[PDB]
């Protein structure tokens, strides 16, 4: 896998040149504590996120929990929960590294084909991933709502800035979009 810094070195290596422009890299360092908080926000809430996302996918499509549905019977529901957690885990690794390679290499490569062979429905998987994207945005911003928290709300207590880490929210969101695009 690569990280944000090794990605920059691969770029420089393509022209056999030194890494000269360090502005973007120095910004990664200046935002490093906020990146760690973003990772902590997702990891610390991961069980709640996964359960709530799969439950949301289901409440919006009862076919999944009826005869012939892909979260029926118990073994299928369990496999779905496990997959949502795997996906979220690899997205968090991408966010920690600042680079999608770990996610692409170790999670997404071959996933579409795997799901096709099993009959796992794309529409429903995408919706689960979309719910997790929204959850992760709110936890990174430290603005989850009581309305969506089901009596399990958590506040992170990181130092507040006006933008609430918009850059990191966009980057996290982009990794979820990459998951969805791999099924397209």
């Amino acid at each position: 896998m690569l990280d944000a810094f090794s990605r920059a070195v691969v770029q420089a290596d393509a022209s056999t040149s030194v890494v000269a422009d360090m502005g973007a890299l120095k910004q990664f360092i200046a935002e490093g504590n906020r990146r760690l908080d973003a990772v902590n926000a997702i990891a610390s809430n991961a069980s709640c996120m996964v359960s709530d996302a799969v439950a949301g996918m289901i409440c919006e499509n009862q076919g999944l929990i009826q005869a012939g549905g892909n979260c029926y019977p118990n073994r299928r529901m369990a496999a779905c929960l496990r997959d949502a957690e795997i996906i979220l885990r690899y997205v968090t690794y991408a966010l920690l590294a600042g680079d999608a390679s770990v996610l692409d290499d170790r999670c997404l490569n071959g996933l579409k084909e795997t799901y096709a062979a099993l009959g796992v429905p794309t529409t429903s998987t995408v919706r689960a991933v979309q719910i997790m994207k929204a959850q992760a945005a709110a936890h990174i911003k430290d603005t989850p709502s009581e309305a969506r928290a089901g009596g399990k709300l958590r506040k992170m207590g990181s130092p507040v800035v006006e933008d609430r880490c918009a850059s990191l929210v966009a980057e996290a969101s982009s990794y979820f979009d990459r998951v969805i695009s791999a099924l397209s």
Binding site: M1, L2, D3, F5, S6, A8, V9, A12, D13, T16, S17, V18, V19, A20, M22, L25, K26, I29, G32, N33, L36, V39, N40, I42, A43, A46, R89, T92, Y93, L96, A97, V102, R106
Partner: protein
């Protein structure tokens, strides 16, 4: 590519874990140490040619037999390639300072080096002397801060070890 963060992610993944306390703490180390290593990287980026030239010149001074007919510094092409090679190692050092792990030097410099130099009958001692010169040359605060110089020296010694 080996860095602080790819090492901890690989270990977490092998155990099926989310990032946890010790992973975040490791990356805090990169936040702290980056100043020293990036200082060294910027110095090296801005002066690589002169730094490699003096290292190359030192290795030829130690081994004048390289200038003799049939030896590895004896033609214009060979002289250019040898300087080039010293500059490659310094560039890979620069990349390693950027990444904060030895990944770029391991993958792009060290892997295969012994087999290449064996096949071409290139002696390794001149590579070692160039890097050795570079390792003993810097001083702080003249060239960079004392912790920057520690970072630069450690990567030169890592390269020397790989050839020794």
């Amino acid at each position: 590519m080996k860095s602080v963060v790819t090492t901890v992610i690989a270990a977490a993944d092998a155990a099926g874990r989310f990032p946890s306390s010790s992973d975040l703490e490791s990356v805090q180390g990169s936040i702290q140490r980056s100043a020293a290593r990036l200082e060294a990287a910027e110095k090296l980026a801005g002066n690589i040619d002169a730094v490699a030239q003096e290292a190359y010149n030192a290795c030829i001074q130690k081994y004048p037999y390289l200038n003799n007919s049939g030896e590895a510094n004896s033609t214009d092409t060979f002289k250019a390639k040898c300087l080039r090679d010293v500059k490659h190692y310094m560039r890979l050092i620069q990349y390693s300072l950027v990444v904060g792990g030895t990944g770029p030097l391991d993958e792009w410099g060290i892997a295969g080096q012994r087999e290449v130099y064996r096949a071409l009958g290139l002696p390794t001692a001149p590579y070692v002397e160039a890097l050795s010169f570079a390792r003993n040359r810097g001083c702080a605060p003249r060239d960079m801060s004392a912790q920057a110089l520690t970072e630069y020296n450690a990567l030169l010694d890592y390269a020397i070890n790989s050839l020794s």
